[PDB]
């Protein structure tokens, strides 16, 4: 395998994985969400390339693995509620009933 064609194959595979991690089932089906999340992370671990922390912070859920999304393609919302602080800022979802809170 040539290195120039291997790099391109790598970016193509990463693009395809992130694209499949999006549209209908990774949003709706929490099972497939977690599955494709695990697959993408096992694929990025094998290449040993660091991931951008800016997105790594608020990337996905930790209980099921759906994209944290509040309310050209009308889709499902990931996060149903996002309160103020009320003591401290938190975010909740629909797919499961757990919530993740961060401190200012």
């Amino acid at each position: 395998m040539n290195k120039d064609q291997a790099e391109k194959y790598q970016e193509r595979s990463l693009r395809q994985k992130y694209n499949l991690l999006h549209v209908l089932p990774t949003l709706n089906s929490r099972a497939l969400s977690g599955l494709y999340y695990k697959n993408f992370h096992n694929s990025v671990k094998r290449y040993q390339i660091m991931l951008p922390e800016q997105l790594k912070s608020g990337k996905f859920c930790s209980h099921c693995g759906c994209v944290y999304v509040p309310n050209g393609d009308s889709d499902e919302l990931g996060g149903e509620s996002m309160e103020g602080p009320k003591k401290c800022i938190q975010v909740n979802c629909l797919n499961c009933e757990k919530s993740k809170l961060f401190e200012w």
Binding site: M1, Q5, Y9, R12, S13, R15, Q16, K17, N19, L20, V23, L24, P25, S29, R30, A31, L32, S33, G34, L35, Y36, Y37, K38, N39, H41, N42, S43, R46, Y47, K56, C61, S62, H63, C64, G65
Partner: protein, 251 residues
Amino acid sequence: DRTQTFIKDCLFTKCLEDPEKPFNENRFQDTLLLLPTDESADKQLEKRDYQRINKNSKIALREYINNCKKNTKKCLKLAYENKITDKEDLLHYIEEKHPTIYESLPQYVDFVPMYKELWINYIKELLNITKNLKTFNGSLALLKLSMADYNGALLRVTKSKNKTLIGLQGIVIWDSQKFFIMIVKGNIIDEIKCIPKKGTVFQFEIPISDDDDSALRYSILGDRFKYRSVDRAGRKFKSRRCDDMLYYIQN
């Protein structure tokens, strides 16, 4: 070192019966050894998060499979009792008369157009399917396909040890290690198909319609699809026996 050797030869001709053997079979050691024989915190956090997400997703997939398997049976029995053959009729009927049982059933009509095209475009750009077909490379394309990802792919069972598994087409939702998960449709069939890989032959066709109507005829083999590299290369392969493939030639 002739004399002491001759003396120990005369020494062996007393104990042993053939004195010249230990030197030829190398049984007289010249030497004998005398020695007693002799930024971490976020890493932990993300590893725990990934382990938890994996452990949850496994149970979620299991429960989804169980729910689908029960709902297919229930809806099929209700349809058979309900005097209903068509799918467009049963779907609307269970919509108006069974609200909850409809949120669990899947909708293949939306499972086709998203998955098929997003996989076809990716495979077309990966294998470099161009308007012209004079820029191909067979071995390199085979290596890429062995390294390629098959999540969200359409595969057809063309040959199998069981005479009933053949001819099944479906789009996969997850790639397991022993079983193969797809979804099939009929007039009233919406079965989630779990098919064994030990002794089956699959195939996938890529449509090419630049000017003419052409398609590539590719195929995979489950028996040896378990010991392949994933997403990369550089893994020591072993010749297994190349003998348990008799069903391929038999029929």
